[PDB]
Amino acid sequence: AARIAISNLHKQTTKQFSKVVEDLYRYVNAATGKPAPMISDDVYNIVMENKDKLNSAIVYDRDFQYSYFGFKTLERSYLLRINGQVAERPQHLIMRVALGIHGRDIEAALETYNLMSLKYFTHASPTLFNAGTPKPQMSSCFLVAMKEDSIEGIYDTLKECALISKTAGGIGLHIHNIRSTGSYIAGTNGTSNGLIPMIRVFNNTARYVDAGGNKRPGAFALYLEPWHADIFDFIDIRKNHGKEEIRARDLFPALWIPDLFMKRVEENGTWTLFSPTSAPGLSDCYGDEFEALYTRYEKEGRGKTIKAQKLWYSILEAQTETGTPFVVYKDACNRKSNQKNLGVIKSSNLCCEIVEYSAPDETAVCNLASVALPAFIETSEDGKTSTYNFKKLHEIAKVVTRNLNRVIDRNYYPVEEARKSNMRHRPIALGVQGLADTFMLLRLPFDSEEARLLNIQIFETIYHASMEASCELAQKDGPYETFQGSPASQGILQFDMWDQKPYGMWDWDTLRKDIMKHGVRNSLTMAPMPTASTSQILGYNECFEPVTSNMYQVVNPYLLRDLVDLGIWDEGMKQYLITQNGSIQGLPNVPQELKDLYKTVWEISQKTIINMAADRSVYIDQSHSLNLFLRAPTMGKLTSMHFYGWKKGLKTGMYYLRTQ
Amino acid sequence: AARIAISNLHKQTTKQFSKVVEDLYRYVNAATGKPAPMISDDVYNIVMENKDKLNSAIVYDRDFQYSYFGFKTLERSYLLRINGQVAERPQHLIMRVALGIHGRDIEAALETYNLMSLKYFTHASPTLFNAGTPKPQMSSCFLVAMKEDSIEGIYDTLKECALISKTAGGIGLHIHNIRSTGSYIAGTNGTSNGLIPMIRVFNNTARYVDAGGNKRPGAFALYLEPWHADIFDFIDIRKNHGKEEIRARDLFPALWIPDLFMKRVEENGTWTLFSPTSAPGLSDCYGDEFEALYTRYEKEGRGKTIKAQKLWYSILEAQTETGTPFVVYKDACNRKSNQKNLGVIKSSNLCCEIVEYSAPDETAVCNLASVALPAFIETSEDGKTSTYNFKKLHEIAKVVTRNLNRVIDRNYYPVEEARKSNMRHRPIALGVQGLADTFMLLRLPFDSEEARLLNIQIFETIYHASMEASCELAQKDGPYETFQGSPASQGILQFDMWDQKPYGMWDWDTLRKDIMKHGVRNSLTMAPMPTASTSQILGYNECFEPVTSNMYQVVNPYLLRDLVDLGIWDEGMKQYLITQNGSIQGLPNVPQELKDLYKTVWEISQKTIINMAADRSVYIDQSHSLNLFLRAPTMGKLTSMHFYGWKKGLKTGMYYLRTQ
Numbered sequence A, B: 001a002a003r004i005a006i007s008n009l010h011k012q013t014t015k016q017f018s019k020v021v022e023d024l025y026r027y028v029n030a031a032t033g034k035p036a037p038m039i040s041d042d043v044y045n046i047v048m049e050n051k052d053k054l055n056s057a058i059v060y061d062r063d064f065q066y067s068y069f070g071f072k073t074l075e076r077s078y079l080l081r082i083n084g085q086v087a088e089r090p091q092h093l094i095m096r097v098a099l100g101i102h103g104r105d106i107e108a109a110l111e112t113y114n115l116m117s118l119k120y121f122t123h124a125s126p127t128l129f130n131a132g133t134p135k136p137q138m139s140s141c142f143l144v145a146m147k148e149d150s151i152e153g154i155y156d157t158l159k160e161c162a163l164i165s166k167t168a169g170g171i172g173l174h175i176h177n178i179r180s181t182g183s184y185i186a187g188t189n190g191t192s193n194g195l196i197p198m199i200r201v202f203n204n205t206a207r208y209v210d211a212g213g214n215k216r217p218g219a220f221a222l223y224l225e226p227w228h229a230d231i232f233d234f235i236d237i238r239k240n241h242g243k244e245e246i247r248a249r250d251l252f253p254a255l256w257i258p259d260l261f262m263k264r265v266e267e268n269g270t271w272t273l274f275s276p277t278s279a280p281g282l283s284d285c286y287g288d289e290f291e292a293l294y295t296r297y298e299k300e301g302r303g304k305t306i307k308a309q310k311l312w313y314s315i316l317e318a319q320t321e322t323g324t325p326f327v328v329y330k331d332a333c334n335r336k337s338n339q340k341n342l343g344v345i346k347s348s349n350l351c352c353e354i355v356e357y358s359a360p361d362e363t364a365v366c367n368l369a370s371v372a373l374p375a376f377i378e379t380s381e382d383g384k385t386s387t388y389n390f391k392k393l394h395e396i397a398k399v400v401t402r403n404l405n406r407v408i409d410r411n412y413y414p415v416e417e418a419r420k421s422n423m424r425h426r427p428i429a430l431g432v433q434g435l436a437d438t439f440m441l442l443r444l445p446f447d448s449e450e451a452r453l454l455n456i457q458i459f460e461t462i463y464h465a466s467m468e469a470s471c472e473l474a475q476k477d478g479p480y481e482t483f484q485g486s487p488a489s490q491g492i493l494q495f496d497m498w499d500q501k502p503y504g505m506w507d508w509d510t511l512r513k514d515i516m517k518h519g520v521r522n523s524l525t526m527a528p529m530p531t532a533s534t535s536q537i538l539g540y541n542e543c544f545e546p547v548t549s550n551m552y553q554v555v556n557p558y559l560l561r562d563l564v565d566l567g568i569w570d571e572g573m574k575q576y577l578i579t580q581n582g583s584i585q586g587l588p589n590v591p592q593e594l595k596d597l598y599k600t601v602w603e604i605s606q607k608t609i610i611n612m613a614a615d616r617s618v619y620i621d622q623s624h625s626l627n628l629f630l631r632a633p634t635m636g637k638l639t640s641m642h643f644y645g646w647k648k649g650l651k652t653g654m655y656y657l658r659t660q
């Protein structure tokens, strides 16, 4: 039923790739008469200086590797359109991206093409949209420093967010340095109205600057340390009742939480709200130095004191009703980062996965790709028994590292703060998809001991691969110029800063030796992301999370197969699945091992989830996007899940909270 | 009953002025501990180098020249406050302003003080608020050029409006160069959403940047030529029903109307809407050159054609329901302006009185004062007969000219575009209040022939005075550096460009002689304004408009007196005045001459109004704020009043439309 919509595009599309390129490159806007080339000069020339190799490299059967709503995703917003009509076949997209990345290095270009066609890995949406086009904006993440506590700084920053927001890419914006409601203003002997009305401005600019033309309104995440005096209204930003003038329903509130806050809450003690003018320096330190400053300011009567658990209660009431604010731990992030030699890090990003240094003159950028976990499953020399090919994983992650590092040099930056930042530090971000499928396919329930060991092994091999590739690059071209002085420069790597020994699949000593000697090309390398749209392009389950339902109507393909094998699949079976809302538990005539393998995420303990996140995190340079799920959520239920994660030492304690 | 609130401030206030200054200069913000001097170094020193002259110059009886709600205006927002409590007596305010203006020129300082105390004239609110303070922002008007048709230009301009909006002063913003709904965007192969969503941004910045601290939200007027393609939604911006997402209820729409539009409407012909990208140059010319460009673009199929009267009908429906959009005539403004040698003028301002050149790098500023017309009435050598002292008027207008020109050199500009603009051209704006009182006091009904002659004489003497004072200044210091090439440089003055000979009270030939020889100091000098708050400080009727009602409860003091004189005033008299809504017409026992003198503005023909505006305008360098009033308004009624004004050659055809 879904080759019917595939084999109509093959009907109404040119075959030869270079002709498609020419077509795109020569395009003209009919309603206007101006030449609108959809390919850059650079890539045009490279295709033409090499027409015959490139044209014969493409294998068009690889267009059937796609699914029901997987293809109609590529169709509806990825493949370049000519006259509101699709002009690019899936393979054409892929080949374009490979060249946009590699330039005159044709050998690299063909390598990338193959591994993407076969679905080994994919680059993030911005790269899929823009690679190979006239002004190549391939980056997904921007972390912006609010430039100064003044109207000038504020409006300079607002400008920058619009300039960034108009060319794809999500924003993490940190605002801890903006004075709160009531605070004194010298220049006009007047009194500030604080964060919420200012939040309304950014909100309004978000709904106006609908990315590029009319593509889609912007998404901002805002980061605040919970000691800021406007905190109670900041967390409530997404409620759907009460006074309309105090909300801001297109933005996401995110908490940048210091350890001190969590102590006061479990101690059932006090918490003191400040304005950053009465208490300067607080976001410019962490850990011990911070607790020394905060405690003194608290002693000096400089703020207002509250019952710590009064705030907590509100925070939980907000999360239960709206699934926000997100929770990320400031101290964990700063203490365990290879960017520490640059200064203090002030926020994460839109999906709580990036952890990079930003300042008024440096805006942090990151470029992203995801490896497809199921692709490396190998049922080798007997069948009905499968193994996992870690040597191939290591191989692939090395190429993805080279791509992402080449992307840095060929990307178009929307703002000069971004170009300065990337050329100096060269951060990079790799992630994954299809974990649940990998588990399902290997017959491991998500909460099994076997699943836990696998999680650890995968993430170890990815980190080691990327560091090595980055080391070879530092041999050809130098190290990144900020390398001198880094934890890496002394032989401290990521698991080191968690005080753990690595699981040991790969040889860390020789890698460390080489690194200390020749340096490394990239300040950072790992940051597992949500894959919300790329994962369904490839047909795997989102991310590194379990399934939400055995029926999205279309039924779990691994479950489906199994019920037929056992005969039991009939019509009583069709029904109690749409009835029981995707649950196979408590179903009369169904074996236990199946019930075990097809637990819905509302049926797995959130304690298990936290543990697996804690396990992989020692292999992550940056952070990762951890959603949480609950049936009939009580205040107590949530409290324990937050504290549990905090104590495991997680950077990102909570992304969304989904309920009922 | 209103010396009760006056003689409590005299109770709770220091006498000696220099002590009040010291008090203000040494002020410290208790809640913060930072020194918050409410006076500049400069003025502090000058008071102290001259303590004894200045202290003994003030006459404190002049504090009783004020009214019921006239004083409680000064009180509630003008007099400098110390701890939420008033610290400045009316006379102190005045003396401060005089020094802020004059510096080390003590003689000038004392002259200004006296004439203000006695209520001869007053400066505009910003000057009353800020003169003599640390960063003196004395200007009321900013005309801003939208810097470029791009996100960068847009957000650069938004910044500038916030920087201007945070330090008092209203804004006129011209936006004719922003591409409309649907228009193509190259950089992101996408389609623009046009003016209305962009208007929502500026709206949102207006309600957020509540002038200075929390003083009061901003007021913007927006200027558009009615050929812009989003016009139909632009005029509807203040309707209070229909889709909430298309309105913008804190801004005022204003039409920058070319002659061509009005012709098409009376011809019952066609009108063509463009985007400024499909039709460039249109706001960068006027008159003939414009009609040549527009007609060609119309021929070249570059826009969309409509029935001219379809637009007109909407415009009138908008005005009838909301009193807006305002109407100002582009061609009249450009053709009759002494700034023509600089380039084409693109808008007026917030109250449709300023007409000055702006560009991305020059933001037009104007500083304003109003002369009090009743003050020069002289019942001389017999009583029960009054004359008008024009020689004193000429005298005073000369000093007000010197003040305003000194204000230019000592003003603090919020943005560099403003400082560049003023230092080069040096514009200036004088106006008036108490016309109706002047008429009432001199026993002339507003529609009398005698009233018409008086209007003309007043405005002639003011213009001639200001030009002469400006000529003497060009002798000491040079002419303004942009003087070479101006209509003034060749002997063409304002009435000249209306092709009229002056009424002749003053000697224009000798003035012209001197000007051609030595130049003049100021590019411009005259612009009668609304006086909405300054007029009630002084207790006179707003502006140059007739009375709205004989009872604002408090009854017309000239009417009141007259009814007692005739006995007829009793209780039947108290009632039929609150009953008849301030009208004395059709009142049984009341003489005709009284009915004639106390016509409410809803009882005077709007044709008379237009004529008087036309008469004075030949003596106005810039423009003036013309409100219009109607009982049971029909589409036809309005149409004739617009066209009538247009044909008289008015710059500002309509400010508000008040109804019922």
Ligand SMILES: Nc1nc2c(ncn2[C@H]2C[C@H](O)[C@@H](COP(=O)(O)OP(=O)(O)OP(=O)(O)O)O2)c(=O)[nH]1
Residues within 6 Å of the ligand: A149, A150, A151, A152, A178, A179, A184, A185, A186, A187, A188, A192, A193, A194, A197, B165, B166, B208, B209, B210, B211, B212, B213, B214
């Ligand atoms: N809502 C609102 N906030 C304002 C306004 N003016 C200033 N603020 C807030 C925004 C900034 O966070 C903070 C400082 O603003 P600026 O540095 O532009 O003010 P200024 O330099 O005159 O005063 P400062 O000496 O820095 O306190 O005050 C205003 O007119 N409206």
Ligand SMILES: Nc1nc2c(ncn2[C@H]2C[C@H](O)[C@@H](COP(=O)(O)OP(=O)(O)OP(=O)(O)O)O2)c(=O)[nH]1
Residues within 6 Å of the ligand: A165, A166, A208, A209, A210, A211, A212, A213, A214, B149, B150, B151, B152, B178, B179, B184, B185, B186, B187, B188, B192, B193, B194, B197
């Ligand atoms: N609402 C909205 N309008 C936009 C967006 N991008 C551009 N525009 C409008 C605003 C400007 O009036 C106009 C031109 O914008 P820019 O000059 O920044 O775009 P660019 O230089 O890429 O395209 P151009 O070659 O100038 O047409 O397009 C957007 O993302 N959202």
Ligand SMILES: Nc1ncnc2c1ncn2[C@@H]1O[C@H](COP(=O)(O)OP(=O)(O)O)[C@@H](O)[C@H]1O
Residues within 6 Å of the ligand: A123, A124, A125, A126, A140, A141, A142, A168, A169, A170, A171, A218, A219, A349, A350, A351, A353, A529, A530, A531, A532, A533, A534, A535
């Ligand atoms: N709705 C959105 N608007 C803007 N940016 C987004 C959005 N969703 C995700 N992003 C950006 O992409 C990253 C998340 O990636 P992901 O959800 O995996 O998207 P994709 O699969 O399309 O690459 C974030 O770091 C964020 O900066």
Ligand SMILES: Nc1ncnc2c1ncn2[C@@H]1O[C@H](COP(=O)(O)OP(=O)(O)O)[C@@H](O)[C@H]1O
Residues within 6 Å of the ligand: B123, B124, B125, B126, B140, B141, B142, B168, B169, B170, B171, B218, B219, B349, B350, B351, B353, B529, B530, B531, B532, B533, B534, B535
């Ligand atoms: N509500 C307002 N907000 C901002 N500026 C204003 C406002 N009202 C008037 N202005 C400014 O002052 C001028 C009008 O002066 P006027 O109404 O006579 O005020 P005032 O009597 O207080 O000086 C306009 O040119 C405008 O720039």
Ligand SMILES: [Mg+2]
Residues within 6 Å of the ligand: A149, A150
């Ligand atoms: Mg400042």
Ligand SMILES: [Mg+2]
Residues within 6 Å of the ligand: B149, B150
């Ligand atoms: Mg541009």
